[PDB]
Amino acid sequence: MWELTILHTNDVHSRLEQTSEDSSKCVDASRCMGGVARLFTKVQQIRRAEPNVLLLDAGDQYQGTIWFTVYKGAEVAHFMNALRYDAMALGNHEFDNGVEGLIEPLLKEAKFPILSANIKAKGPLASQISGLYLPYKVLPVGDEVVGIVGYTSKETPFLSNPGTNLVFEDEITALQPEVDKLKTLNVNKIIALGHSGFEMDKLIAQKVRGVDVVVGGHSNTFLYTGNPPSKEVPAGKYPFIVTSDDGRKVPVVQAYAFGKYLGYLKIEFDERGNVISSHGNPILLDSSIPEDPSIKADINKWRIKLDDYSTQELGKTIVYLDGSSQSCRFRECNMGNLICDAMINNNLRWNHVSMCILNGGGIRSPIDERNDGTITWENLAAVLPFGGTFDLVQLKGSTLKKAFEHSVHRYGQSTGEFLQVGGIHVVYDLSRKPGDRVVKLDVLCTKCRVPSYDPLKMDEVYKVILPNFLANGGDGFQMIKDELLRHDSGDQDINVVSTYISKMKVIYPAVEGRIKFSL
Amino acid sequence: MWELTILHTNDVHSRLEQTSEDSSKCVDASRCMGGVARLFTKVQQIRRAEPNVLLLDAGDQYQGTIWFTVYKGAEVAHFMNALRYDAMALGNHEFDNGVEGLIEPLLKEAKFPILSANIKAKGPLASQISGLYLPYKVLPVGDEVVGIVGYTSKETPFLSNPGTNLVFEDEITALQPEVDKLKTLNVNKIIALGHSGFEMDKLIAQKVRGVDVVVGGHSNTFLYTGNPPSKEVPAGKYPFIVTSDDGRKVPVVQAYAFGKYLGYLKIEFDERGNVISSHGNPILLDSSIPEDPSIKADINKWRIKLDDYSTQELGKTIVYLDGSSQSCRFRECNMGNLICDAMINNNLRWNHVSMCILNGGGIRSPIDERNDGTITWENLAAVLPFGGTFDLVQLKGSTLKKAFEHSVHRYGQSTGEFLQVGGIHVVYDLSRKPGDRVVKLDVLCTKCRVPSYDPLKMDEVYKVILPNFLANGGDGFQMIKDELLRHDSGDQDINVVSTYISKMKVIYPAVEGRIKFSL
Numbered sequence A, B: 001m002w003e004l005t006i007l008h009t010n011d012v013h014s015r016l017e018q019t020s021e022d023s024s025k026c027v028d029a030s031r032c033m034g035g036v037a038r039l040f041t042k043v044q045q046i047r048r049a050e051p052n053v054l055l056l057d058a059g060d061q062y063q064g065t066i067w068f069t070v071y072k073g074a075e076v077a078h079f080m081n082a083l084r085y086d087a088m089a090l091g092n093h094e095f096d097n098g099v100e101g102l103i104e105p106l107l108k109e110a111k112f113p114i115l116s117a118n119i120k121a122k123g124p125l126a127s128q129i130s131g132l133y134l135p136y137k138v139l140p141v142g143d144e145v146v147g148i149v150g151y152t153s154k155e156t157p158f159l160s161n162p163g164t165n166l167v168f169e170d171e172i173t174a175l176q177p178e179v180d181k182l183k184t185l186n187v188n189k190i191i192a193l194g195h196s197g198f199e200m201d202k203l204i205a206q207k208v209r210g211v212d213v214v215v216g217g218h219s220n221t222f223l224y225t226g227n228p229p230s231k232e233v234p235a236g237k238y239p240f241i242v243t244s245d246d247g248r249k250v251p252v253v254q255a256y257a258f259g260k261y262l263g264y265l266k267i268e269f270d271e272r273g274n275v276i277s278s279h280g281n282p283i284l285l286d287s288s289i290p291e292d293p294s295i296k297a298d299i300n301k302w303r304i305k306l307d308d309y310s311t312q313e314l315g316k317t318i319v320y321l322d323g324s325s326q327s328c329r330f331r332e333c334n335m336g337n338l339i340c341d342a343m344i345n346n347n348l349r350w351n352h353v354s355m356c357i358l359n360g361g362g363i364r365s366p367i368d369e370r371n372d373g374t375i376t377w378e379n380l381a382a383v384l385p386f387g388g389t390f391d392l393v394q395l396k397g398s399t400l401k402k403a404f405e406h407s408v409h410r411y412g413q414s415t416g417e418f419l420q421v422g423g424i425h426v427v428y429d430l431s432r433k434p435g436d437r438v439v440k441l442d443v444l445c446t447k448c449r450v451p452s453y454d455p456l457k458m459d460e461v462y463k464v465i466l467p468n469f470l471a472n473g474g475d476g477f478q479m480i481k482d483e484l485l486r487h488d489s490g491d492q493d494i495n496v497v498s499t500y501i502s503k504m505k506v507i508y509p510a511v512e513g514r515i516k517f518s519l
């Protein structure tokens, strides 16, 4: 029998340095986690112990901290080469700086295959990008050969900036002919490595004949067998077993996000490449694992240029700024209220925009207050990494009512469309059918001398400050894009929040009942 | 028969210049009201028409605008002498700058008798103040004589700063022997002129034998017969008829506040000084009455020194700052929220005071936004004229619960104890018995990383920022004074709100459900 050890990361999102338990900037070094130096140490311990090891990445290395803001993907190629990744699948955030932002710093510099079977290039781009990413790779592992086939979310055009020249096909339709090709070349051990979310990973495991293992990302899924080591609640056992249509038990794995864990799956194969069994668990990369000094020294060398974004203190917080997805995609989070209050305050400088809506998935990180409360550009850069704008927009009450129904239409799945608000008091009843969950919606009046809250009226018009991402129909808010009456472009997102914090000096945004649930 | 015309003012509170309909600074001159130049014109028109006229003041000329801040009562003696007041009764605000603040600028400079029968001086003060105010005066009016007897609120020691050396006796007990003295001197026409509120004015009319008329103040009572000319809703007919214990019909009058109206009561007496009948109404001092140019010119001469408090713009408001008593003593008013937000913001500069309570009677004026939104020291001086401080205090939840029960214990009478809040969400049910009207009370947690609202606990302790007036048991909040665990003195009230506004630049405080009523 032949044993393979798959080590996998996903949704690392520029967490090159070690971080806090909430994946924000490391303050108390004794309880810090993750980061590529610590990962390098654990990978090395496994490569010493196990003869057949593959180190895989399921996408979204791009976007998340000042590392990516400054180095634009060169830190990813440099530190993934130093860690000796065997393969990587393209994620949606790999296209955030267009195709050239992917081609030049990463595709042309990676010393490992970068994969995606369902991305087809067309027109002039097709010639330049040929061979820079591959539909699959066959990798020698000891005396055997392992096929790895890539896949990328079909939603990348709606989430990122891949351009017109790239077509994202259905993953199952694009994967089957590649897996069939590998089987004709007698590759009997096949890993599907990709970035489409756990639900799609489960469908690929079921529908794509010949796939032995699925290693995914995108949904930040935490899977565990037994008692979990930190705050992440497991969504299922590790590995997650799917029984395929042809009757094979297919393990599906994912390792949360931000380099906090290293996925570890041991697979026992027979001579014909059949999975006899498999077992493992994500390894928490906590303080007990030492950071490799060679990688840490090289990180400290690259950190010098980034220290210009931490020397200038913008303001000070006396509260934890909860920008976690567990809060911001499920309920009112004070990071949401802060950003919506900065949005309204920057604009109100004799203009009358009283209302704000902000997608929870746009808040990419919390900020900690225990470093004497100090907030820097570096801290803000991880909360608002996209370089978007906060736009003024004019909407009918009916349109706003539909947006709030979309905010909770499939609540409970940690999706980014949950809205954080300002100048709005919304009440939900999740017991009701999707599309009819908003039980109360009051808005701060504008055509009144003393502003107060009153029921929203379907026939009335309202001025709303919101990200350009929402104004352009992002996160399924097509009603905002289709039904809006006016859309003006506003100032840069990070500059708006920064200018607000420096004026306030000390901030203490609270959760105050802007969003409520009715039992 | 002999006819007397009584013209009366009360609670003018330094409104020497004409003002807006809400009694705040005049912006649109074409719709402005009151002010002493306009009053002088209407008084003159009546003195030309009627041979027997008395111009009376029932107290509280002191405190209210930059006029009093700067001239400290010299403007009151100067402009009351110029208007030719026949008599004035002492109010509680006449003692705001102590006994010397009353003696020197007003008592020693008034060319008319100043009255109070129930104020008895003791110790060294008794010698200095002898003859400076009188228990009564007998005034010649044509061929007849009219006795005027003064009275001042027994609550002046709890509201103002009269010192230890002055005793405020029960008005009824002090008035009867003075009215009896006037009757032995054969003065058959007696006016009780004083400053104790409409309820006490009604009791004096009933219980003090020999009083023909009561002219009051303090409660800002608006009385009218017929269709009223402005926003003030009448509390009864003008005059208000009380039937005394000895069976006489006694008219009781009051003329709202701030010099917006001139009280006008015509009384028909027989030869034995019996009131045969009476009639009249408060005259609205609106734009249609011209300001007397001699008084206006003299006001413009005195206004030069006060223009140093209007040249410096503190900030800008884009909302009406509702500091009216009709809002601030009955429900959440945004002037209250603004002041409580300045109170918390000034203090939070690693201190953790999340809560604020502010008596509604401490907000002495609104601010208008139609002068391009500009806010000046002059505008703030009329909102916060006392020169008090916003103190930090430590209270048991039980104590805070009792203070909120006191806030609405006799709701509906426009009393100053209604509390404006910050970092507190209170719900009242007025249907319940007094002392049991608070149905919900949530407070912003402090021993938590993310502040949120949670039910107040009786056994827990809380840090609260509030005026020194409240910390010292003012407005019947004896439980705060008796039961507090710690009381530190804070910064000056007006400087705290000013420093806040200049930092914010544009303010837009809203009514947001901090205070609610349950049906």
Ligand SMILES: NNc1nc(N)c2ncn([C@@H]3O[C@H](COP(=O)(O)CP(=O)(O)O)[C@@H](O)[C@H]3O)c2n1
Pocket: A011, A060, A092, A093, A159, A160, A218, A219, A220, A359, A360, A361, A362, A386, A388, A414, A415, A416, A417, A467, A469, A470, A475
């Ligand atoms: N607010 N701007 C904004 N701009 C973008 N370019 C953008 N791309 C993704 N998002 C948000 O991020 C959410 C997806 O986050 P995750 O579930 O963690 C998958 P991801 O790692 O972003 O590919 C979406 O639901 C959106 O709310 C984005 N939000």
Ligand SMILES: NNc1nc(N)c2ncn([C@@H]3O[C@H](COP(=O)(O)CP(=O)(O)O)[C@@H](O)[C@H]3O)c2n1
Pocket: B011, B060, B092, B093, B159, B160, B218, B219, B220, B359, B360, B361, B362, B386, B388, B414, B415, B416, B417, B467, B469, B470, B475
């Ligand atoms: N907040 N400070 C403060 N300091 C003072 N020195 C003071 N004196 C009076 N008040 C408030 O003013 C209210 C009385 O106002 P009115 O009913 O208009 C009678 P007034 O003209 O003040 O004598 C009281 O209930 C208090 O709330 C006062 N409030």
Ligand SMILES: [Ca+2]
Pocket: A188, A189, A190, A210, A211, A212, A272, A273, A274, A275
């Ligand atoms: Ca196989």
Ligand SMILES: [Ca+2]
Pocket: B188, B189, B190, B210, B211, B212, B272, B273, B274, B275
């Ligand atoms: Ca009489």
Ligand SMILES: [Zn+2]
Pocket: A011, A012, A013, A060, A093, A218
């Ligand atoms: Zn991701």
Ligand SMILES: [Zn+2]
Pocket: A060, A091, A092, A093, A195, A217, A218, A219
């Ligand atoms: Zn993704």
Ligand SMILES: [Zn+2]
Pocket: B011, B012, B013, B060, B093, B218
């Ligand atoms: Zn008064």
Ligand SMILES: [Zn+2]
Pocket: B060, B091, B092, B093, B195, B217, B218, B219
């Ligand atoms: Zn008074």
